[PDB]
Amino acid sequence: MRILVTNDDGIYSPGLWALAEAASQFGEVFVAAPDGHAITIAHPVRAYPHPSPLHAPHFPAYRVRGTPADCVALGLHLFGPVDLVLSGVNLGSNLGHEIWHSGTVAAAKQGYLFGLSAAAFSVPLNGEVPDFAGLRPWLLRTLETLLRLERPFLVNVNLPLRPKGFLWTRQSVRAYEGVVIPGEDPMGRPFYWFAPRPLKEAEEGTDRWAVAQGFVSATPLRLDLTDETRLQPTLAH
Amino acid sequence: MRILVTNDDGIYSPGLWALAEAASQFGEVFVAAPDHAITIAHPVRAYPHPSPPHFPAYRVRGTPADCVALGLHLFGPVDLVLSGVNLGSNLGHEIWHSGTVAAAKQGYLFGLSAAAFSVPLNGEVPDFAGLRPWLLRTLETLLRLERPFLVNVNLPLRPKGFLWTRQSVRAYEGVVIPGEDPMGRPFYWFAPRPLKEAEEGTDRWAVAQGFVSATPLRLDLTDETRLQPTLA
Amino acid sequence: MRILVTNDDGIYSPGLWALAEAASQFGEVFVAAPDHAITIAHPVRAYPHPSPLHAPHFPAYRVRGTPADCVALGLHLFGPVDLVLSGVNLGSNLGHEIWHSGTVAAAKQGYLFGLSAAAFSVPLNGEVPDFAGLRPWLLRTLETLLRLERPFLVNVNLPLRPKGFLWTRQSVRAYEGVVIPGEDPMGRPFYWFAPRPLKEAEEGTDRWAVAQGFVSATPLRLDLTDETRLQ
Amino acid sequence: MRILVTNDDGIYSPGLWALAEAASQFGEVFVAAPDHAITIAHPVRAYPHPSPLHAPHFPAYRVRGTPADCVALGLHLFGPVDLVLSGVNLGSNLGHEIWHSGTVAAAKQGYLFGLSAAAFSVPLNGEVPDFAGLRPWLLRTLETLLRLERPFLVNVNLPLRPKGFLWTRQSVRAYEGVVIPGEDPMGRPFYWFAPRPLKEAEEGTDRWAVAQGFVSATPLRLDLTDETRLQPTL
């Protein structure tokens, strides 16, 4: 079991090393983390060997001057063959509508596009970093569960600061109300505050609802964005 | 009908005005385009901008999603959000990281109908005058759909037809080619390639055949075949 | 003495905490590092941050802004501050590099506010700094700076394994433009830029000193005016 | 004389073409403008850029890099070059702003390569600059610059409607910190920074000069060493 660990926050993020350490209990771990979200193809990318931190076990590692997906492409090359791609633990949530724009998810998705199993890991912050020592038991429990899954898999994981359980969830998909509030800076110049708000509370069974309940959320994701119910649409006239 | 037109290439792209003009044949058009989620951490600046026909327009120092939120405030009420015409394809796996699509998706999240428009490139620059008839046809077709809708459109340089399509979803094999710059420093080229030919009925397949591709999109990324009960 | 410590690499950089710890040996340290001018346009966010596990406790904030922003915000949240220390940066800040250095800009901003300040950097050249080994030298350097008349503005570059300390002047070499063409996968062209210095660094300059293995300390001016060209 | 003209605002700035046209009265002009340090991480892309129907033609490239990259590439594609002109920037570059100016960085890069160079900027103050009105002043300034001993490095700020020309020194004022808290409509806290200078700009400085209506030209030094402190009293 060879595991490539990457993230979106960069090579110095405490979240990256917490995931690398948790993952090492399940196989050999290699790290490639960044110094857009797609693989850079128009030109060469720089990547250099990087010494893992003093207060973490040792892990072979590279700092990549590219995107999280670039880290996956490079990692599969330098440390091949790789069986699993783990991305995170991101300092900040990746829930509901957020999954679309997540670099952390983008790395995991890239691993899956290459035919490997993958999972993204994130922790909701709201002004307060996480305690990775306390989350460790939960990181391990989550990884254990993921490894029993039929492969390949693609899962998006969100762990609350202090977990009280685990739940497989679906993505929260809420409609939003547009809220724009005009304002002016200290210089009298105008600007606009954007504060779009969801129309309802997160529904039970969703990732958003689960973390709010103190549960680790695991959402299996698909790659296909096709709305399969509208391929032969009824047209008015 | 009131239509907000935006894009990802910015206020100076000819594709934007081509889209704005085509849309004007179906309703009142307003433009808000960048100078991918909605900016909330800080406020956004936006300025009136002249169109190169005339359209009320703003240049926004934010993301395409920002342009949609701002356009709604500046030009509300709005019924339809159109994004593009992007110079470059937004096919298959590209849909995920597309700013053009992100704007259309934002409009849909606000309860409106939306569509993204892109034209695959390389070597040849789009002739929007030639594309106009196909743009109008596509728009006319989209406006016959049950609402609301969210569709991703890719038009080839010179279309010969229109097809509804599903997104191309292919596996890739990694390709990494180590190298050195003229100063002997190391670097890596990435050239991952698709494992097979695009499937029939997919967006990538359709454009390759010279047809306009229109893929309806789903917001929910949940894979229900892998949902699970609790073990309590 | 109250000391504000910041940097350009961010709140998670090991060089940041190495500087804070070394500084704590001379006064009470407060930290504000980014998550180069002061952001006057829009509002900036800042959050209380916990000091690293294996490091002394330091009141600290993670700032969603520039190094100069950290200085401005820091003087507000921890005022009064006597000294601003920026670094230790991972990468050199020698000669022509000083002008556009973010680490240096934080220090300059402190000076602009009427305080003493110093920037600390360690040229890497492919390796990584060992802050445990550099501590004695960081301390010796701080000790020497605190003997200066206040306020002062000094740029410090510490080689990985220092064998001495020297006051230096900034190296100012002329460069030669080296451009080598190449092509992307579509055969489209691009160019590699590799400008190179024309001569060796002059003795006594910051570049020269680090190449000798010495810690370089360059006092900086704020005035870019070339007085010899006025009149 | 061959002249490389670049800027920080980009290939479509009217300020760029005004400078290029003024420079053409003095020698052959070539343009390389962005699409502050030289990029060495990856290679930089550049593409031939066309001249408009109603404009004199200048060989030019749009460069996907920094203003400094434009200078290096420009020296390669159009070399040999004798002078590097950067601007005209839409917005001032006075006093403390000089350190963060991309317009100035390009001129400085030219100087680092052994050439003469000058940066040009116009403070906006809520107006759109009139380059037909500024042209005479651009020409007078170039005339002054071109008789200087070479190489030179000068930072020029032209007021919207100049009435004179002054050699100035950079304004260097101390500041007082001003931080004013606030919170977004969602109740989240944030901070506004509004540091302010302790005094009015001194006579003879670039800021004073422009406030008075004069074109300001400041010769710049590369050496940031404060030599009055090379052997301090500890």
Q: Which residues contact C40 (CB under 8 A, 6 or more apart)?
A: A186, A187, D193, D194, D195
Nearest neighbour of D185 by CB, restricted to A44, A65, A181: A181
Structure-solving method: X-ray
User: Rounded CA gap, B212 and B89, in Å?
Assistant: 12
In this structure, the number of other CB atoms found within 10 A of the CB of residue C127 comes to 10
CB of A120 within 8 A of CB of A107? yes
CA distances to A227, A230, B92, B213, B221 from B166, rounded to whole Å, are 8, 9, 9, 9, 15
Sequence-separated (6 or more) residues with CB below 8 Å from residue D212: D164
In 10 A of CB D233, how many CB atoms? 7
Gap between the Cα atoms of B225 and B212, Å rounded: 31
Q: For residue D217, give the amino acid letter.
A: A
Rounded CA-CA distance C25/C39 in Å is 32
Mutating which of A43, A126, A191 best tests the D interface, going by the most D Cβ atoms within 10 A?
Answer: A43
Q: Do A42 and C14 touch (CB under 8 A)?
A: no
**CB < 8 Å to A128, chain C:** 47
Where do the H-state alpha helices sit in B81-211? 99-109, 128-142, 203-208
**Does the annotation list A70 as a binding residue?**
no
Q: Calculate the dihedral angle through the C-alpha atoms of C73, C78, C80, C81, rounding to the nearest 10 degrees.
A: -70
> Which one, of D68, D67, D81, lies nearest residue D15 by Cα?
D67
Give yes or no for a contact between B190 and B176, defined as CB atoms under 8 angstroms apart. yes
Nearest residue to A120 via CA among A81, A162, A86? A86
Tokens for D185, please give them.
Answer: 């409509």
Sheet harboring A165-168: ordered strands across?
A: A47-49, A61-64, A28-34, A2-6, A84-91, A117-123, A154-158, A215-220, A165-168
Separation CA B67–CA B102 (nearest Å): 11
Beta bridge partners of A119: A86, A155
Q: Give one DSSP letter per residue of D149-165, joined into a string.
A: PSS-EEEEE--SS--EE
A117 contact residues in B (CB cutoff 8 A): none
Q: Percent helix, strand, coil in chain A (nearest 5)? A: 25, 30, 45
- Chain C residues within an 8 Å CB radius of D45: 184, 188-191
Residue D232 and residue D212: Cα distance in Å, rounded? 39
Q: Which of C128, D136, B43 is nearest to A48 (CA)?
A: C128
Tokens of A31: 């790290």
CB contacts of A48 in chain C (<8 Å) are 126
Give the helix/strand (H/E) hosting A69: helix A68-78
Burial (CB count within 10 angstroms: exposed 0-12, middle 13-18, buried 19+), residue A45: buried
Torsion sign (Cα): D164, D168, D170, D174: negative
Find, among D75, D232, A24, B130, the residue nearest to C152 by Cα: D232
d(CA D25, CA D43): 34
Known binding residue D8? Answer is: yes
d(CA C98, CA C170): 9
Which residues of B are known binding-site members? 8-9, 86
Residues A66, A63: Cα–Cα separation, whole Å:
9
Enter the tokens of residue B108. 């849909």
C206 burial via Cβ count (<10 Å: 0-12, 13-18, 19+): buried
Q: What are the residue ranges spanned by the domains of chain C?
A: 1-231
Q: Which class is D1-234 in CATH? A: alpha beta
Q: Chain D residues with CB inside 8 Å of B48's CB?
A: none
Backbone angles phi, psi at A92, to 5 degrees: 140, 145
> What is the length of chain B?
232
Contact A185 C13 (CB under 8 A): no
Protein fold of C1-231:
Stationary-phase Survival Protein Sure Homolog; Chain: A, (3.40.1210)
- Amino acid occupying residue C17: W
A partners (3+ CB pairs within 8 A) are B, C, D
Contact B158, B210 (CB under 8 A): yes
Do B101 and B114 touch, CB atoms closer than 8 A? no
CA–CA gap between residue A75 and residue A85 (Å, rounded): 9
Do residues B103 and B8 lie in contact, with contact meaning Cβ atoms separated by under 8 Å?
yes
The length of chain C is 231
Contact A13 C13 (CB under 8 A): no
Reduced to 3 states (helix: H, G, I; strand: E, B; else coil), residue C149 is coil
Kindly write down the DSSP assignment for every residue of B39-76, as one continuous string.
--SS-B-EEE--------EEEESS-HHHHHHHHHHHH-
Please report how the helices A103-113 and A68-78 are oriented relative to each other, as an axis angle in degrees rounded to 10. Answer: 40
Assign domain B1-232 to a CATH class. Answer: alpha beta
Q: Tokens 């200087």 map to which residue?
A: D148
Question: Residues of B forming the annotated binding site for a divalent metal cation?
Answer: 8-9, 86
Header resolution in angstroms: 2.2
With vertex at residue B43, the alpha carbon angle to CA B39 and CA B46, rounded to the nearest 5 degrees, is 95
Query: In 3D, which of B194, B190, B217, B3 has the Cα closest to residue B90?
Result: B217
Cβ-based neighbour number of residue C19 at 10 Å: 28
Q: Please give the Cα distance from A36 to A67 (Å, whole number).
A: 7
**Which amino acid is residue B193, in one-letter code?**
R
Contact C134, C15 (CB under 8 A): no
Among the listed residues A37, A103, A31, the one whose alpha carbon sits nearest the alpha carbon of residue A74: A31
At D59, phi and psi to the nearest 5?
Answer: -65, 130
Identify the DSSP state of D213: T
Q: Which amino acid is at B178?
A: P
DSSP D176: E
Comparing CA positions, the residue from D99, D1, D104, D17 lying closest to residue D52 is D17
Q: Kindly list the partner chains of chain C, i.e. chains with 3 or more CB atom pairs below 8 Å.
A: A, B, D
Helix (H) or strand (E) holding B17: helix B14-24
Identify all chain C residues contacting B43, using CB atoms and an 8 Å cutoff.
42-43
Distance, in Å, from the CA atom of A115 to the CA atom of B172, rounded to the nearest integer, reads: 7
Q: Which of B221, B202, B220, B223 is nearest to B211 (CA)?
A: B202
- Give the span between the Cα atoms of B207 and C207, in whole angstroms: 58
Four-residue CA torsion sign, D62, D68, D69, D73: positive
Closest CA–CA distance from residue B129 to any residue of chain A (Å)? 27
Task: Give the 3-state secondary structure of residue C104.
Answer: helix
Query: With contacts defined as CB-CB under 8 Å, which chain B residues touch D12?
Result: 12
* Structure-token match 């892998």, residue found: B226
Q: Residues of D near A (CB-CB distance < 8 A)?
A: 41-43, 45, 180, 184-186, 192, 194
Q: How far is CA D160 from CA B111, D31, D132, D212, D213, in A?
A: 48, 24, 11, 12, 8
Contact D43/B12, CB-based, under 8 Å?
no
B77 in helix, strand or coil?
coil
Question: In angstroms, what separates the C-alpha of B154 from chain A's closest C-alpha?
Answer: 14
Q: CA of B141: which chain A residue's CA is closest?
A: A235
Contacts of B153 (CB under 8 A, 6+ apart): B84, B115, B116, B117, B118, B138, B142, B212, B213, B214, B215
The Cα–Cα gap between C135 and C56 comes to: 15
CB B109 within 8 A of CB B219: yes
Measure the CA dihedral D26/D27/D33/D36, to 10°: -70
Please tell me the total number of residues recorded for chain D in this structure: 234
Neighbours of B40 (CB within 10 A): 18
Side-chain-side CA neighbours of residue B4 (13 Å): 30
Tokens of C166: 């020297």
Residue A88 DSSP SS3: strand
Are A124 and A93 a contacting pair, CB within 8 Å? Answer: yes
Q: Quick count: other Cβ atoms within 10 Å of Cβ A177?
A: 12
Give the count of alpha carbons within 13 A of D58, CB side only: 30
Find the angle CA(A160)-CA(A164)-CA(A165) to the nearest 5 degrees.
Answer: 95
Q: How many CB atoms lie within 10 A of CB B230?
A: 9
Strands D2-6 and D44-48: unpaired
Phi-psi region of C49 (alpha: psi -120 to 50; beta: other; left: phi over 0): beta
Beta strand pairing status for C2-6 and C83-90? parallel
Quote the CA–CA distance of B76 and B64 in Å, as a whole number: 17
Compute the nearest-CA separation of A31 from chain D (Å).
Answer: 21
Strands (E), chain D: 2-6, 28-34, 44-48, 60-63, 83-90, 116-122, 153-157, 164-167, 175-176, 179-183, 189-193, 196-197, 214-219
Phi and psi torsions of D138, nearest 5°: -70, -45
Count the residues in chain A: 237
Q: What is the least distance, in Å, from the CA of C13 to any CA of chain A?
A: 6
Q: For residue D73, give the nearest of B97, B109, C180, A28 by alpha carbon.
A: C180
Annotated binding site of C for a divalent metal cation: 8-9, 89
Distance from the Cα of residue B190 to its chain's centroid: 25
Rounded to a whole number, what is the distance in Å from the CA of C231 to chain A's nearest CA? 38
Element (H, E) at B23: helix B14-24
Integer Cα distance of B37 and A96 in angstroms = 12
Mark yes or no for CB contact B181/D43 under 8 Å: yes
Tokens of D26: 């003095």
Distance from CA of C23 to the nearest CA of A (A): 21
Point out which residues pair with D155 in neighbouring strands: D119, D218
The helix (run of H) or strand (run of E) holding residue D112 is helix D102-112
What fold characterizes domain A1-237? Answer: Stationary-phase Survival Protein Sure Homolog; Chain: A, (3.40.1210)
- Determine the distance from the C-alpha atom of residue C33 to the mean position of all C-alpha atoms in its chain, rounded to a whole number: 13
Question: DSSP secondary structure string, B168-188?
Answer: ----EE--EEEEE-TTS-EEE
Distance from CA of A44 to the nearest CA of D (A): 6
CA D215, CA D138: separation in Å to the nearest integer? 9
The string over A183-219, giving b where at least 16 C-beta atoms fall within 10 Å of a residue's C-beta and e elsewhere, is: eebeeeeebbbbbbeeeeebeeebbbbbbbeebbbbb
Judged by CB atoms closer than 8 Å, whether chains meet at A73 and B192 is answered as: yes
Instruction: Please state whether beta strands C215-219 and C153-157 pair in parallel, antiparallel, or not at all (unpaired).
Output: antiparallel
Residues of C in contact with A10 (CB under 8 A): 12
